[PDB]
């Protein structure tokens, strides 16, 4: 108990101690970059001690450790919600962060402001952890903005690049829009209900919670980059790759779904939210892949490749799977973030080249890079027993074997195969074929530090996702019984994506001229949603402002 | 309340008898010192306010505005001396004297126990401002904007004088404490509808109110940095003070008369925010930005909800700290490029590292970053509108968005950009310049640690 | 302006790049490149100015529906991956003046030569004014081209910043 | 054509002006002249003690740098947190509320020596 | 990315070696300062192809205006040396 709670709160305060050392003193320069990493390394250990106790005891502890404010009949505190999600989502985030931690200590050697770089990387981590552990909307709101702001600087690290300034505000524009539902939700729980503490919210079990949940639906629309407020998520790839690896691949993007899960007791009864959320992911989960089938940017493609995974997570919640969707969060983060780092290896040896068509001949010229690229893809595509398959097979269970919209299941599998399609298009140019990079060879990855970074993040997907399944205790009645094809439909359509893309990929070798096609451009040009909605809408708001 | 009035007065001999080169220091040293004693005014009581005598008294609401004013005089001096270094000795004493009187009227204003006395000081407070704005103005374009201040007296002050007098004859007294117990139900009549307009239109223009704001953008475009700070940090806040107090006697008539006022802001907020994105001036952009935040307060006061008043108090505080810092921050560039144009200089983070840190710092809290008081109040008010009306969230949401859109733009346009090649006088940040910003940002966050001191009287 | 003759090139090189990204594969690229150059050599000998003028409208009306959905762009060039990514680190030279003394004490040698660099930025300035007043047409200079220095020891006017412009990689 | 003689001659000057100019960006051996700065002896202790390395005598230094974190950054905060937790938090009502521990068949409770009645005999499936 | 240094002497053959694989030139007649049109008996359209190879060779675009005038290998070296600020 005491030991469990006490040792748990150290991580949030422990992580902040290096930050307190940046605003004060000048004792030891040139060593902070390692200082932070070891703290996470140490933090991870203190993030695993709660792991043991929680699994054995399942001790969900809400700790109110202050009396901040008090209005008539309200009270705010700097409390934390030590429960399943924090105990199980924190270890993964640090694990990924720990990998990314040492990844960035090498890639950004070209930045004199590297020390500043870490002055914010550690900041975001703090806010994200506070967000998930938050017991109240307000404190939860704070993290909802910290991720919003910490992204602003990290997104726009190179403030000179016009893409950063435009993209950074594009996301901030969207990120703020999502909060409209968030602030609305607080108002409703303050008017109809009377508090922002989840204890009262769940226990009272609202009978008409359409409005508060509708705000939650909007919250995830922009923050998690769902369709309708999606375009910004790819836009983050105009800046540092390590920055994209954590914020927009593993940590910030998970915010949108997280709130719905954290309000699981309320979301169950109202199916109005479920349908639109179920449909919202449906339109997004394919619109991301449908667009992604022909995109030609290594970093953006990964963003779209991440987008579809996120788009499907909403469907997982849309099918009323509270704790099963949670797994998809951790499982996806491992490799995809590693893929960002792997994409870093490609960009490193390429000396600032990113076009997918300017890559190849890397199977043996990039042996280590080739090593982990397939696992993430195979795990991403749903290779059995791998980190991504567990969710992919499990998640498709209820959706295809429980009450769901007819059209909802339609795009559910069409894009599912597309998930593997671009992976083959990627590993093809990335690894298959003879080299196509510029004449001079800058290829070198005999860097021990990165190998440590790749080592740590290569292992987790292979084994950690498998391990994570065992310890977690029962919370649901698994639908182990279903028609064999439905149980194996993923096991049926999975191989189709590789082959179908392989059918598409190899026929392009032949020396035959090309032919334009509208759909080839509709998906390639992002469905024209960004190309249009990011011209007129700025023009409407601004060109019409003067009058 | 005399213990702060006389020492404020004593600065005048200090501003005058002092030596040639110690004119700045002496006032600065004590002026900072006086504010320390100002903190004593936080001895509030749960059920009763603080009633010293028949001439002054400060409740929970009054004190936070008092602290800001006294806390703000030394900061105004700090920025001033750069542009006044060239001025001759005698005038500097003249300008400095006006501030001391300006503080004197303000501190007596918010602490006034009798409304007419408040009315008297209210008119007096303007006189120092006009000299400061006019005598040491930054322009010579003769805008001929007198009609607005003539309109102020015609549609504002002068009607207020008659209503105040009428109340005393009818009710029998204008002491707010008496009003608490002799307040009578103001039934509906055409006369009262006229009386209602007399008690509020005077304060609406000063806030200001959308449509009636034409003087503020042109008031800052000419007022020097010393004049600008008090205007947006203190003078704008006078209307809310009286409006909160005066509205004690306008019920139930306010239950329907507020709608034309409420609609002016509810829609006024968005209009101002959008135009800022089009503005071509660091100060003017702040001007309308000032109208934005002040618009939120007007709605809070009229609906008169227990949460509205709590949130309103901080909005005046945070905005006063916010805008005041922004002017100083913006006027930091003025000390180099001698311009208000926002596009003349760009990419200043390349040459003013610590300056950009303030810019990012100040802008963060301008858009009500959590948990700062900029958001505690603003977020307090948004919830209150929901009980009054659920639809309001649309406009508040839009206003916050655009307020978040332009706030970062101004930061983006100047600091996050490429340096102007031809500019060749971007000297390193001076100790005075950085010090001035620091005194602003720091306490602004500190109050977030302890919100119980600017929660208003309802807490 | 620029004549249509040079306007031929502006589609010759550009059309390849979209074709290049379309080609992807190396053997395809050269072969298809030969296909395109062969088409050029269909009319490369065409010396008819009316037709050569008229043999460019369709080409531009032909390329629009062949342009790449995601055309490739070089890193350092505008719109590329490294498009001004390091402009945030490049620092103006003229700011050298405001360096604090103690800071300047670290590099006594380098600043010593600069005084001579600026020396010829000052003394040479006067004659640089006249140096353009013989190559100065009335009605405003016709073009922005500049001449060299027709003597020894001086330098072509209007040169200071470009010669002292920072380097590509500040770090 | 090419850079016209004036342009090419100009470029020779402009480029060489840059070539010679860019040479100024290196540094002399004394430069960048930094002041002496003081040294803490325990750091001096490793400076001379690390001029050898060795197998057992290199991990010791790296181990030592890992000894600081154990007590300075971890043990102290938990004492501070727990101490504050022990008296300044636990001493309050409902500041910490922990879910009542689960209950399983075949379990005994320390407090009252309680007993969990064993479940009914299962239908005895194939197992 | 450790260090991708650039040296004029090393770059010397990089520009010239590009010409060493051309099928329209005799390698031995070619010189460091040889004008392409006259000394090498080439044309602007032929010269266009050489300029393109430098962009695949080194990886950085070339403006249309300045590409034409680079009729001398030294000038091409100057363009590469001067644009990247390489002096030794």
């Amino acid at each position: 108990m005491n030991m469990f709670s006490s040792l748990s709160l150290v991580t949030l305060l422990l992580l902040t101690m290096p930050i307190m050392m940046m605003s004060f003193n000048t004792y030891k320069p040139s060593n902070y970059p390692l200082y932070v990493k070891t703290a996470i390394s140490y933090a991870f250990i203190t993030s695993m001690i709660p792991t043991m106790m929680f699994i054995h005891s399942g001790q969900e502890l809400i700790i109110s450790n202050w009396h901040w404010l008090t209005i008539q009949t309200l009270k705010l505190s700097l409390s934390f919600k030590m429960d399943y999600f924090s105990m199980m989502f924190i270890p993964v985030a640090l694990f990924v962060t720990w990998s990314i931690m040492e990844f960035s200590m090498w890639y950004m050697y070209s930045d004199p402001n590297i020390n500043k770089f870490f002055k914010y990387l550690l900041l975001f981590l703090i806010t994200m952890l506070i967000l998930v552990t938050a017991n109240n909307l307000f404190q939860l709101f704070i993290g909802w903005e910290g991720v919003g702001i910490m992204s602003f600087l990290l997104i726009g690290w190179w403030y000179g690049r016009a893409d950063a300034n435009t993209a950074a505000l594009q996301a901030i524009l969207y990120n703020r829009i999502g909060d409209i539902g968030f602030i609305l939700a607080m108002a409703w729980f303050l008017t109809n209900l009377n508090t922002w503490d989840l204890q009262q919210i769940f226990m009272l079990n609202p009978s008409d919670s359409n409005m508060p949940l509708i705000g939650l639906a909007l919250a995830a629309t922009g923050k998690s980059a769902q369709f309708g407020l999606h375009p910004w998520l790819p836009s983050a790839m105009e800046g540092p790759t390590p920055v994209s690896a954590l914020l927009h691949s593993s940590t910030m993007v998970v915010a949108g779904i997280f709130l719905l899960i954290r309000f699981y007791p309320l979301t169950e009864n109202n199916k109005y939210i479920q349908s639109i959320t179920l449909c919202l992911g449906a339109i997004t989960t394919l619109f991301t892949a449908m667009c992604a089938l022909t995109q030609n940017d290594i970093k953006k493609i990964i963003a779209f490749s991440t987008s579809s995974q996120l788009g499907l997570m909403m469907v997982t919640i849309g099918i009323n799977q509270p704790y099963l969707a949670f797994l998809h969060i951790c499982t996806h983060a491992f490799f995809k973030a590693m893929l960002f780092m792997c994409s870093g290896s490609i960009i490193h040896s390429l000396n600032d080249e990113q076009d997918i068509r300017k890559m190849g001949g890397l199977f043996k010229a990039m042996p280590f890079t080739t090593t982990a690229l397939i696992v993430g893809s195979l795990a991403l595509t749903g290779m059995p027993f791998l980190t991504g398959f567990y969710s992919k097979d499990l998640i498709i269970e209820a959706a295809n074997t429980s009450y769901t919209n007819a059209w909802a299941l339609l795009m559910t599998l069409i894009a599912t195969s597309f998930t593997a399609i671009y992976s083959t298009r990627i590993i093809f140019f990335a690894l298959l074929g003879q080299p196509r990079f510029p004449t001079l060879v800058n290829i070198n990855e005999n860097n021990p530090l990165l190998i440590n970074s790749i080592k740590r993040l290569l292992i987790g997907s292979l084994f950690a996702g498998y391990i994570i399944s065992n310890n977690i205790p029962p919370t649901t009645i698994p639908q182990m019984t279903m028609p064999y094809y439905l149980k194996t439909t993923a096991l049926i359509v999975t191989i189709l994506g590789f082959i179908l893309a392989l059918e598409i990929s190899n026929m392009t070798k032949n020396l035959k001229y090309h032919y334009p096609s509208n759909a080839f451009k509709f998906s390639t040009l992002l469905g024209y949603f960004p190309t249009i909605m990011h011209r007129l809408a700025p023009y409407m708001n601004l060109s019409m402002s003067q009058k | 309340m005399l213990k702060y009035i006389i020492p404020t007065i004593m600065l005048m001999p200090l501003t005058w008898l002092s030596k040639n080169n110690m004119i700045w220091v002496n006032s600065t040293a004590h002026s900072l010192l006086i504010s320390f004693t100002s903190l004593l005014l936080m001895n509030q009581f749960g059920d009763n306010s603080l009633n010293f005598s028949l001439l002054f008294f400060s409740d929970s609401l009054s004190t936070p505005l008092l602290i800001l004013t006294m806390w703000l005089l030394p900061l105004m001096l700090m920025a001033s001396q750069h542009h006044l270094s060239k001025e001759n000795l005698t005038r500097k004493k003249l300008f400095i004297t006006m501030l001391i009187s300006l503080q004197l009227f303000l501190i007596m204003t918010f602490t006034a126990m009798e409304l007419i006395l408040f009315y008297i000081l209210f008119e007096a407070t303007l006189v120092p401002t006009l000299i400061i704005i006019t005598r040491w103005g930054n322009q010579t374009e003769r805008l001929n904007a007198g009609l607005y201040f003539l309109f102020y007296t015609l549609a504002g002050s002068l009607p207020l004088l008659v209503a105040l007098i009428y109340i005393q004859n009818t009710v029998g007294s204008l002491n707010f404490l008496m009003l608490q117990y002799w307040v009578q139900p103001v039934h509906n009549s055409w006369s009262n509808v006229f009386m209602w307009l007399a008690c509020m239109m005077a304060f609406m223009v000063k806030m200001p109110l959308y449509g009636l704001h034409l003087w503020l953008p042109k008031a800052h475009v000419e007022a020097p940095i010393a004049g600008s700070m008090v205007l947006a940090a203190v003078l704008l806040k006078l209307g809310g003070y009286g409006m909160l107090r005066i509205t004690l006697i306008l019920n139930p008539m306010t239950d329907f008369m507020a709608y034309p006022f409420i609609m002016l802001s509810l829609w006024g907020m968005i209009m101002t925010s959008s135009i800022c994105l089009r503005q071509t001036d660091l100060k003017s952009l702040i001007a309308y930005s000032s109208v934005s935040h002040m618009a939120l307060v007007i709605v809070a006061i009229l609906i008169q909800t227990p949460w509205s008043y709590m949130g309103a108090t901080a909005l005046m505080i945070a905005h006063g700290l916010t805008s005041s810092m922004l002017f100083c921050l913006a006027n930091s560039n003025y000390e180099r490029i001698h311009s208000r144009t926002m596009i003349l200089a760009r990419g200043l983070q390349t040459l003013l590292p610590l300056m950009a840190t303030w810019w990012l710092l100040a802008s963060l809290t301008n858009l009500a970053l959590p948990p700062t008081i900029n958001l505690i109040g603003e977020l307090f008010v948004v919830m209150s509108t929901f009980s009054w009306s659920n639809i309001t969230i649309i406009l508040m949401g839009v206003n916050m968005v655009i307020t978040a859109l332009y706030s970062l733009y101004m930061l983006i346009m100047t600091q996050r950009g490429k340096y102007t090649y031809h500019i060749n006088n971007i000297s390193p940040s001076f100790t005075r310049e950085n010090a001035l910003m620091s005194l602003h940002i720091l306490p602004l966050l500190l109050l977030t640690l302890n919100p119980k001191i600017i929660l208003g009287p309802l807490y | 302006y620029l004549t249509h003759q040079q306007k031929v090139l502006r589609l010759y090189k550009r059309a390849l790049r979209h074709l290049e990204s379309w080609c992807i594969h190396r053997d395809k690229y050269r072969y298809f490149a030969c296909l395109l150059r062969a088409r050029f050599d269909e009319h490369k000998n065409e010396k008819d100015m009316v037709k050569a003028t008229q043999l460019l409208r369709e080409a531009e009306e032909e390329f629009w529906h062949g342009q790449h959905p995601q055309p490739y762009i070089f890193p350092e060039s505008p719109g590329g991956t490294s498009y001004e990514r390091y402009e945030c680190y490049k620092v103006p030279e003229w700011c050298l003046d405001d360096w604090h003394p103690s800071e300047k004490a670290m590099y006594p040698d380098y600043f010593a030569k600069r005084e001579q660099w600026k020396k010829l930025r000052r003394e040479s300035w006067e004659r640089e004014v006249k140096q353009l007043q013989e190559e100065t047409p009335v009605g405003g200079p016709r073009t922005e081209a500049l001449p060299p220095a027709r003597k020894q020891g001086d330098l072509p006017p209007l040169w200071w910043h470009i010669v002292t412009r920072p380097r590509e990689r500040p770090m | 054509s090419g850079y016209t003689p004036e342009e090419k001659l100009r470029l020779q000057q402009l480029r060489e002006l840059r070539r010679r100019w860019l040479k100024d960006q290196e540094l002399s051996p004394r430069e960048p002249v930094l002041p002496p700065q003081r040294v803490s002896p325990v750091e001096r202790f490793w400076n001379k003690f690390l001029q050898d390395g060795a197998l057992w005598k290199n991990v010791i230094y790296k181990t030592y740098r890992h000894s600081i974190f154990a007590f300075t950054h971890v043990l102290i905060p938990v004492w501070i947190i727990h101490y504050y937790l022990k008296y300044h938090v636990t001493t309050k009502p409902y500041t910490i509320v922990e879910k009542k521990p689960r209950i399983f068949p075949g379990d005994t409770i320390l407090e009252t020596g309680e007993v969990i009645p064993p479940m009914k005999e299962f239908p005895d499936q194939h197992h | 990315s450790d260090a991708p240094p650039l040296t004029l002497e090393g770059i010397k053959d990089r520009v010239l070696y590009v010409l060493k694989l051309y099928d329209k030139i005799d390698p031995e007649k070619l010189s460091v300062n040889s004008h392409f049109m006259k000394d090498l008996g080439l044309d602007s359209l032929d010269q266009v192809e050489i300029i393109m190879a430098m962009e695949d060779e080194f990886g950085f675009e070339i403006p249309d205006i300045d590409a034409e005038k680079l009729m001398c290998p030294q000038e091409i070296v100057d363009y590469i040396a001067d644009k990247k600020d390489v002096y030794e």
Partner: peptide
């Protein structure tokens, strides 16, 4: 780092103040 010396001077804003 990768090569001995090869040190290039840095132009910076005056950080003293």
């Amino acid at each position: 780092s990768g090569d001995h010396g090869k040190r290039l001077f840095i132009i910076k804003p005056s950080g003293f103040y």
